[PDB]
Paper text:
To prove this concept through protein engineering, we focused on a two‐fold symmetric inter‐subunit interface of a recombinant horse spleen apo‐L ferritin (Fr) as a target region for mutagenesis.
Conversely, in Fr‐F5/59L, the introduction of leucine (Leu) imposes steric hindrance, effectively obstructing the pocket's entrance. These variances in pocket morphology among the variants are anticipated to impact ligand binding affinity and specificity. Replacing Phe59 with Ala or Leu significantly reduced the incorporation amount of NR (1.4 molecules for Fr‐F5/59A and 0.4 molecules for Fr‐F5/59L).
Residue numbers in the entry:
A (entry chain A), B (entry chain A), C (entry chain A), D (entry chain A), E (entry chain A), F (entry chain A): 1 to 174
Write the structure that this text describes.
């Protein structure tokens, strides 16, 4: 058996591998969102940059989970990565709504893994999630909600104007 | 009796304590305004920051009054602090109108205390208000009036657009 | 309903608002303690400065709770703030005893909210309290206990001398 | 139709999307290789670092292809990403042999796309591959070959010793 | 009774004192390991330095526990410290195996104390262990496991050569 | 036999190991003294810091003896470490008296080992003690005596006042 593994259940080990898959899927979704907004017929640079940053952020989350798996003596196992749910992502509003749905799904997965760790009396797992994931996720969802509200406020009956303004005046661009 | 107190009436001492209560109430109102605009379903960061700054500014006014009370040999007495008049503050326009009403009420209290000090031939009190409160208050009310006019100009028939623009282009934010 | 709220019970939301009230009440108590020790007939600058710092520290705790409430998608609700329990605070010893009673009450409220969050399987709440409140509170209570012991040691039968010495040689002043 | 697209065939557009998939698959393979060598029961840090760097390098190649797709007015389309060919990667020698097989497959795909672009008289495509991919790939394969030879030289009849030495003295580590 | 103690059970207080004893025993074990590898007839400086660093690290853990005991209002109680389990520690491999056994025993003690704190609804205790001990322990055990694997790889049939190489090329020395 | 050992008797080797035990016991005593003075119900920071520094100083003495044992080709042997003589240490005066008794016992052990080395014509041993231990010990005992006199002077009939003053004005603290 493993020479380091201690207090690390097979259930947690498997759920960690599933969570890695979810984060890599999310990263891939954000890559697709970013390149959609980079299209010449969409052309919203600040939106492209927002989602490209999230793609990297989710990849980093996957890396941290994988590092932790090895630190605990579990075995990282990779599965196929499903493609994103859409090929074209509609408006900034559509995209931000899809992103918050995605993040709520990741958050629920975090909460489920935390509950499993608590049930298994695995405090290292619980602390790892609390310290590196739960607050970052709450912060991100709050940000997305703030953005949704500002996007929604700007729709009015001049949708194109509002979409431009949001990208120019809220999102970070050159 | 007090070893330092000189030319400091009981009427002024009491009115100073009442004024502290008014400034702390105002500070609390601004705390509530700030956190309303921080809500994910309101999300106007520059508005949040404007009112949070005013919360601190009013707290500082209360501190100065309390310092002065002690310098004069009066006794600081604290009363319960009433909660703010609203739990939800409507639009930026609604909020800025409530703020200017609040400030006019504080200004009238300043003017009333100055008149009491003048009647009591308390020039230190009168100078203290003139030097640290009256002009700061006039400056703040002017600023708020300038803001009200710009907000009103932006309502038109695209209210959400104007509310965004004001927050982005007039108020200070990240 | 809220677009961000997830795993955030009404019970926790209410208890957070109650806790904000408790921290603001504590802040107000410390404001009163500070200005008492600033009186010309009390005149213990290091004691004034100790309690003024705590007033700010408790205000900051309230701010953090309110920020968290919004991050979670709860609604900040403010209530009236009761005045402090005393108008005059006796000796440094009396004041430090009142402060430790106050802090033990805040600590119990923290522990109660943590237990509620644990019962509700709200790990973000539990981590927030652990990371920003519980240890800070334990550290503060320990400090106060250290101070109480030194004050008590100095009473002897030369109380005024000991009260001066403590203020001069332990507490931070100009 | 597209407002920018010019001299950009559907065949090239599709082959670019396929190539993105191949690079992302390669990146994923290298992520798996890296975490295998990070296991406590493998523990070859320089090998872990070599493959983690390649994972990032292949991701960057995919990003460049996607940027180019948009610059040309094609549509980035993402497909499912197959998991890597192995869950456990054997020795450093096994791993480096798998890596060179992978890279030769990527190189052939590059050469095939270049031939398609040449047949289609698409010089921008051909120059893009020549300038950003072909030489980088030749350089990488040469490096891997150099490594294979040194690993092979070190097998002898003291395989563990040689595997350690290679990791310590050729590969970059802390 | 104690003037600060709150929510701090006698069971936790005792278990903290036992844990201090375990950490000091571990520190003493590492002192002995370090001086064994410093012998002229062993002479593995990097091994000496590894274990001397761990001796200090475990002493620091004991200090932190003792600081916490006082912060909580418990009473630090010291017991006799048993000598280390061996006078001579064999090979680097033998020593590293003894060290990982020691660390797994310390980790189990940490986990047991965390479970007691959880049962006692002592979140400060649980957070203290999570924040300052559990991850540091997992990190250390992983490191030791990595070392064991590299040592084992180097045994082959040239044990002395491999032991030298490990000390020279993995462990930190002058 | 040992390849380096020369002019190093078994008697000296054993006495060196006994002396290490005495220094580690002294270090442990000082750890206990330090944490006693850190208690919230004792709270004499300068006293805590004095004894914590001595704990480290005695540990360093043990390290030097162990280094020397190996340099001479003797074998370091560790025994159980007895717990300190008291769980609670009374007043600063009580504690400083216990410390000087402890140091006189260590000094006598140094003098006894020096006499053994002289009898055995072991000048390296004698020089080692003279150069690194004897004067440091005389200096420390003198310091402790100076402290005892100042503590005793301050008892008078206001013991608590004097104990505070000594800690504040002689001992080093924040
Ligand atoms: Cl498959
Ligand atoms: Cl009342
Ligand atoms: Cl009310
Ligand atoms: Cl599909
Ligand atoms: Cl005993
Ligand atoms: Cl024994």
């Amino acid at each position: 058996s493993s020479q380091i593994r201690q207090n690390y259940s097979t259930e947690v080990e498997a759920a960690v591998n599933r969570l890695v898959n979810l984060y890599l899927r999310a990263s891939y979704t954000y890559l697709s969102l970013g390149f959609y907004f980079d299209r010449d017929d969409v052309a919203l640079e600040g939106v492209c940059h927002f989602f490209r940053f999230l793609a990297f952020f989710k990849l980093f989350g996957a890396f941290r989970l994988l590092k932790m798996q090895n630190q605990r003596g579990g075995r990282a196992l990779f599965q196929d990565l499903q493609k994103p749910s859409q090929d074209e992502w509609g408006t900034t509003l559509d995209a931000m709504k899809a992103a918050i749905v995605l993040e709520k799904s990741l958050n629920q997965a975090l909460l489920d893994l935390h509950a499993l760790g608590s049930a298994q009396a695995d405090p290292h797992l619980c602390d790892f999630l609390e310290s590196h994931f739960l607050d970052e996720e709450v912060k991100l969802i709050k940000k997305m909600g703030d953005h949704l509200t500002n996007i929604q406020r700007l729709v009015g009956s001049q949708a194109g104007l509002g979409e431009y303004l949001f990208e120019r005046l809220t999102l970070k661009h050159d």
